[PDB]
RNA sequence: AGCACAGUCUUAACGAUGGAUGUCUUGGUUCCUACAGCGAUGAAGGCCGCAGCAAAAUGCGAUACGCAAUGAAAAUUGCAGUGACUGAAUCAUCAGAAUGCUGAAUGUAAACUACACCAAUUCCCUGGGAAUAGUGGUACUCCUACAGAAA
RNA sequence: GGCCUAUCGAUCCUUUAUAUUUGCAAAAUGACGUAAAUUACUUACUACUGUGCAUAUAGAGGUGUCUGAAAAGUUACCACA
RNA sequence: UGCUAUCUAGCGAAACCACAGCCAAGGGAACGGGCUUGGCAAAAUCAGCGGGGAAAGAAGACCCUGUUGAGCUUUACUCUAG
RNA sequence: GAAAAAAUUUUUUUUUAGAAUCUUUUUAUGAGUAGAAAAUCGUGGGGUUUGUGUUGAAGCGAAAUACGUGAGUUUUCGUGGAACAUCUCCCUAGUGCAGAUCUUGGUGGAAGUAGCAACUAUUCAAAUGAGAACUUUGAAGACUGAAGUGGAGAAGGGUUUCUUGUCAACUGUGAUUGAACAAGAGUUAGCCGCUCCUAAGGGAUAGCUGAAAAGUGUUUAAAGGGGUCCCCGUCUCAAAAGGGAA
RNA sequence: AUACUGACGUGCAAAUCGUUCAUUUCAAUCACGUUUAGGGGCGAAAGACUAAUCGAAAAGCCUAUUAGCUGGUUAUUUUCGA
RNA sequence: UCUUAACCCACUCGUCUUGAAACACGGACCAAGGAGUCUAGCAAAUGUGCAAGUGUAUAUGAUUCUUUAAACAUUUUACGCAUAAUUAAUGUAAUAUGUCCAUUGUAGAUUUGUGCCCCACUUUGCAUACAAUACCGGUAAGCAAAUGCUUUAUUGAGUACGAG
RNA sequence: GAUGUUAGGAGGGCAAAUCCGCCGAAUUUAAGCAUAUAAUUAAGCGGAAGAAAAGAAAAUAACUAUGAUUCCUUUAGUAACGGCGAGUGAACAAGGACCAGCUCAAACGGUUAAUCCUUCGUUUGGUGCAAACCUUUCGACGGAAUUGUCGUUGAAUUAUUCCAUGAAUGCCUUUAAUUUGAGCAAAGUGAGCAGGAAUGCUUCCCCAUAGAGGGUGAAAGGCCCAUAGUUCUUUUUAAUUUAUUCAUUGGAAUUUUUCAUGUCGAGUCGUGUUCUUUGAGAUUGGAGCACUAAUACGUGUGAUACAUUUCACAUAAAGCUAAAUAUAUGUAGGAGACCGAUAGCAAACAAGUACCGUGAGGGAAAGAUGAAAUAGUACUCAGGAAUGAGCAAUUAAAUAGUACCUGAAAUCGUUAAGAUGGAACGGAUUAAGAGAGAAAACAAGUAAAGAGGGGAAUAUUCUCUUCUUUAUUAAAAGAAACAUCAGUGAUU
């Protein structure tokens, strides 16, 4: 609002949204943390990582929990183990889920994650 | 041209379309000027950046009554003040080198204005805590308690602006102290008429003096 | 754009070969070639009159007129019937101008402000403001004019302690300093009779500003308020009268 | 502006108020003021008579401030004085008001109007009319030539 | 399992055809604010290259879609292929290193990979040993200094 | 002015007339006139003040395509509206 | 006589086109395919043809006009290189 | 400020106007190009007001016992799938089309027509393939007729070459063909050319002019070679047919 | 490139094709390279030619040149109306 | 509502032209785009604010800082235009001063009275029109010892209780 | 003056929106045209910068005078210039923005050039990881220059008062601004309904110093990034805080008193003349040429040629200088009462491209499936193949299948209905067909039993209500028709 440094246009925000560097991609691949965990870490939302365990809260796939398979940064879609779908030829792939639609249960711990948690708390 | 319409006086026959300019920067330019001077003053410790002019006469028949801010005090007024040119540069008074200080009344008024400023002025120590009597008719170095106390207060910068003049000028005079004698219209015409006779006489006076 | 609709060279091969006498684009294999070059009827032809910054966008709005508009709008804001006509939900309000104590000026939070509006009786007005968040249609959207909201209270304040920060970020509610009143805020869409909420500080300062106590810096320099042409607008009472 | 225009009244009308027979074309007598005396002589003679010719000597650099002339009539001379002050002068036979017209911005006092009879006033100015002078003497006032 | 008239024109219904209309919009547009020169220490421009599979604008320059370094920092992925559990895989920053041939272009040339001349040259090792026909310099004008000649 | 109804010409320009009327931009050019004064930049008082140029007013010098361009031919080589 | 035309199979345009498309006379912008009155007038076509469409084309090259030109010439005006 | 009807005085049913560019009433009037005025209606955007949205709006086609003298407005069904109004008031404008040999884009009638007419001619059989007048093989018939539809080379083009595939479009017929498309392959020099030399020529140095840009080119020079410090000297590019080792 | 004012004249072609005819040892023809550039060149003279361009080439600009002249100039009702 | 019928009537629209159904010109067709505008200065109109003033110019100022690129403010002889005309021009310049009443007529809006209200007299008498005087600047003429004068002529966009 | 591939250096060229120079037109206007006009504009050739140039009086005034430059408001559409026609046209003052001064040069200093530079070196500081920069005095050895560098700004002389100076010890404290990158950053992914799936609708919660913006399977303050708010770290520049002793050398300013009264830019000014230019007018500026000066009590100015004389003001012919001010190009932000794919930049895109031109040059057409193709047409059958169809199949949706959104009109196809003797359509008025409709275009109330809803009395008793349903009495409304009037005709 008050700052005149950054544009309030639709146009700049969209271009920034599409041309993202990796840290920005990581920011907009964050998900909301579980309620006791939010109290524990003092943190609303966290960037997704490989072995995280999420619960789906939106779409036809809502109420399903599960581990994250692969994250697709380019299409901004995470893949989870029990959201399979067969394709036109019957090949099974995982449904890609935008990270807005999932709440994170058990985050994966690692050295980088520890540093992030230390930074946050 | 047709009907009751006045003859035009426009000059748009030349290629004016690349010789035209429209001001859309005005209020922001004004803001920028304000910002620039404010920043400058603050950088100078908040000390005045204002320039104190001599009072000088506006010229010719039309404006001779009026008086305005002039270019600079110059040597005779500075000498009457007891201030050096170097001091005049050092302090906030305006500087010059070729404005003559003219008549007595104007000089006397401007030395009084200089004296008013000179009395007004307080000067911060040059090196801080190594106080001296110093040069140029500039004040001797201020003490630490006073200068700090003064720093907390507003500067008094009223004298920089032009002064006002007599508000009513409707004054009384008793009937028996005035007279009906005068012939002003006659006096004017005669004065212009007798100019030639005097000019000739004065030229002869000037020749005699020069001899 | 200055050169737009005119940069191309232009040519005329159609006169003596039965094609209309507007200029045509020269060249061969390009499919611009032989097409109508420019002129306001043409593809690529630009404006009939090119817009320029020469245009008289602004106006001189005169000092006495400006003052009169502010004073008269404030007087109009006064009138209870006009407030309701302007669409303010006036029903539970308890005075004709809405005047609150000095103690208003220190209020500190959006909730406290909402509580105060509810306490005044403007809950329904606050409901209309919340409702009035709607998308503005057409090309405005592409030019970042996304929502339109309606206009409720105008808060007139002297002291800067809380109200300024508190009534900031309240949808549809406006703030103004007593000296620096704004006709654009007092009468949106040129509509007389906006709901005005005053501090006692503000109300008293207003009286000083436009003449009272003769305060040298606060007063507007030798300003005199206008007087009505009609002394009393109750014409029907004149008609009713015995002499009449 | 655009929505009230004459073009909006005449929008589908061909020549559209400029003459179907005429078939409207720009400056058809020639440019600007140019047809004056030649083709527009009748207009210029009837509406701007003294336009053509050369009259008088020349003064190469005029310098208008040299000959500057701010006037007042005697009629408005008393008007430079406030009402209550004027009442005091009316009351008190023994005194007259001095008026510095130059300090109020004027150099010449002219003779239009009335001075109230039996009521002295002192008028200070650079220039006075013969009539103004006569009135000031007549009413028992004084005139002051002043620079 | 029969029965229709044809052709032409018109009407309604349903389609083809066509790309208008409507809806968008990482683009334009004008204004205001802000900083604002590169080059023989070889710029701009132009070629010629360079991707594992690679043609292109893009990107980079024989170390070539990046090298080093810093800050982020676990993936990458059309296929193949390359890593993690934090100087590796990925970005961004980018100061170090590197920057073919040209081009003012400057050894003589120029529809030329044509042609001079002077230095032969480089690396490794701790004051010596090995490699390579390779690499530089040498334009025109000016200036200061020096030189040996000419008052 | 011609017994009446005809016998004639803008602006700019030039030219000669005319004036107790004017100007040439800080000033002056009769005349140191008339008085006094006499150390001198003295002091009053005066309708009539150099050459040249500019005005102002009044005529005249001309525009006969006569309510006023300083303007010869030519195109079967021709072009355009 | 050849080659075409013709007919089939195949591929496959354009100029042109206010709406059109039988006459006669009349009046009319004074020579009508449509108008008024008369003659009349009955699908669909194939092959030709040149009476008409004041047929198609190119903003009358002719002529006249423009205070648009351009070219050229002279003892036209005004200059000017030499 | 009370009129009527229905019931069974009382119950029930309808109505009951006061907004000045306004309402009631009366009489007169009603042509129209060029032209002037007023009242309207619509489009883009803005403020304002109070609404409409995916229990499908706008948009679009077809309509409606619809309303308006009219422009239009309103609405239904069908399609459609996201944003739409303001007549409450008022500002603003790239604001209203049938036409301009209009601009731009698409499309017809003309029309399965004009046409595919230079250059004497093909036939039979077989093979391939889905399919053969015009592919391939053979047999015939013919023609070009050494100023050749034959060989070579220059300009110019530039992988068009060649093998191996091949048939969406192209190859103005057909097409399995192809100079189209796809994947590869391929041009080897001491001696052949260029490259070298000078010419007609061109560009400069030396000068000199010209504000410079340029115009000139040994022409008022302290300049590349041979010699035991001496004797000579404007340079440079310019021929793929002149000169020129093999 | 003389004639058939041949064929062709929405071409094979924005000048072709057929037949006829002129030229053929010199003021010959051909190539390549070269020179001379726009009010300029060059011309066995026709105002010829100077890249489908010429009584003044092509390119770009002054320029949206100018045009008393040609064409076009956009919803509705009502009123006065030449 | 659509649809044919049938009786009666019904000439290609636009266009320039006195005159087009034309043997006058443009138009094969459909869709989209497609032409009195903008700036400067001026005028009258009407609204609005103020009035012998008016505008606030450049600019300053602020407890003004998403929208604020506007809005708000301006510590008593700045300037534009209007408050005076005349005129080549030095220049000159508006009742005439015995009176704070304040030019002369004729119509003329408005008011008192008489004989609810139109009335019929009288009564008072703006705007405005038609005139008239005055008086000022120019110009004559007459005078002129310069405080230039003088009845009379003429002339200005004049002036005779300010309107911008 | 030559010569040097001697040793060290510099220039060249490019880019151009604004800037500075030159050189330098015409279309156009006058309704013609010649002077004037376009215009000291365009093009040409040069030079610069983040601004440039201009600038410290050979100035303006005639006042009670002002006093470097630039800019604005203004004077002013005025003085003035002009076939005095068309047309052109300043400056000074005033109000302001903003303001900054100076040095060569003569003159002065000779018991000594007190100067300058290169090369060689050498040390008192300070950063940085490292590269490396930054201060710092001291000596050489070369040169240069007296045909003039350096110092001095009249000359001494008095008193006053400051500044440079060097050493020791002391001391670098605290904040305030200012400005970067950085971070942290409020509440729900709660019912229920319909939905392909909410960010919808409800309904129960809330948070806001964040209800700006963007993304997120339909409109989100509470889904995410962001935002408001803050915590630091970064830039510099203010305040505050602290200095104390001991030491030489040097300079400067006033102030007395004497004494020195010197000085001030030449083929330049000026004048003539010519051509140009302007406001310049019997010549404003420039330029060519001719003639060619005076020295400070001079000579340059005071807008009409001149002579003769005043008076005021200035100090040419050498030089530099920040600021306000301008900026259509490059880059970076921020914008909008702008355009919405025939528009907007020629370019929403693999466009300054393709393509065309001998070349200089000229120069396009060209966006959108869906929420998700990590949902992009599997499978079967008939086909030589293309393709087609499917009981098969993704999707919420395939007359949604990548020439994919919506999909108008022209155009053309299928079916049905009508019409059809040299046009076609129309107007006015009926007709027959073919469609559509019940909203005025009939039926209030009453009784019976279903579905809902309300109000009162002190969570539920009383009571009021509307729709479906069975049938049961009204009635009104229009169209006809006749009669009756009143108005207006015609008839006998």
TrEMBL record, chain A:
Stretches the record annotates as Disordered: 1-23
Keyword Ribosomal protein tagged: yes
SMART domains: KOW (SM00739)
Domain (KOW) ranges: 47-74
Biased composition (Basic residues): 1-17
Annotated TM spans: none
Keyword RNA-binding part of the UniProt annotation: no
GO BP of this protein: cytoplasmic translation; ribosomal large subunit biogenesis; translation
Top-level taxon: Eukaryota
GO cellular component: cytosolic large ribosomal subunit
Keywords per UniProt: Ribonucleoprotein, Ribosomal protein
One Pfam family hit: Ribosomal_L26
GO MF annotations, alphabetized: RNA binding; structural constituent of ribosome
Stored InterPro entries: KOW, Rib_uL2_dom2, Ribosomal_uL24_euk/arc, Ribosomal_uL24_KOW, Translation_prot_SH3-like_sf
Family: Belongs to the universal ribosomal protein uL24 family.
Annotated protein name in UniProt: 60S ribosomal protein L26, putative
TrEMBL record, chain B:
Cellular component, GO annotation: cytosolic large ribosomal subunit
Biased composition (Basic and acidic residues): 204-211
InterPro entries in UniProt: Ribosomal_eL13, Ribosomal_eL13_CS
A GO BP entry: translation
Gene Ontology molecular functions: RNA binding; structural constituent of ribosome
UniProt keyword annotation of Ribonucleoprotein present: yes
Feature: compositional bias, Basic residues: 194-203
Gene3D superfamilies reported in the protein's UniProt record: 6.10.250.1480
Keyword Zinc: no
UniProt entry keywords in alphabetical sequence: Ribonucleoprotein, Ribosomal protein
Domain of life, source organism: Eukaryota
Region (Disordered): 194-211
Family: Belongs to the eukaryotic ribosomal protein eL13 family.
Alphabetized PANTHER family for the sequence: 60S RIBOSOMAL PROTEIN L13, LARGE RIBOSOMAL SUBUNIT PROTEIN EL13
Name of this chain's protein: 60S ribosomal protein L13
Organism taxonomic ancestry: Eukaryota, Sar, Alveolata, Apicomplexa, Aconoidasida
Automatic annotation (TrEMBL), chain C:
Assigned keywords, A-Z: Ribonucleoprotein, Ribosomal protein
Descriptive protein name: Large ribosomal subunit protein uL4
GO cellular component terms attached to this protein's record: cytosolic large ribosomal subunit
Family: Belongs to the universal ribosomal protein uL4 family.
Membrane-spanning intervals of the chain: none
Swiss-Prot/TrEMBL GO biological process terms: translation
Portion held of the full protein: 55 to 298 of 411
GO molecular function, one term: structural constituent of ribosome
UniProtKB/TrEMBL annotation, chain D:
GO process terms (BP): translation
Domain Large ribosomal subunit protein uL15/eL18, chain residue ranges per copy: 71-144
PROSITE patterns: RIBOSOMAL_L15
Keywords: Ribonucleoprotein, Ribosomal protein
Matching Gene3D superfamilies: 3.100.10.10
Signal sequence extent: none
Region (Disordered): 1-37
InterPro entries: Ribosomal_uL15, Ribosomal_uL15/eL18, Ribosomal_uL15/eL18_sf, Ribosomal_uL15_CS
One GO MF term: structural constituent of ribosome
Residue ranges with Basic residues bias: 1-13, 20-37
A Gene Ontology cellular-component term: cytosolic large ribosomal subunit
Family: Belongs to the universal ribosomal protein uL15 family.
Protein name per the record: 60S ribosomal protein L27a, putative
Species this protein is from: Plasmodium falciparum (isolate 3D7)
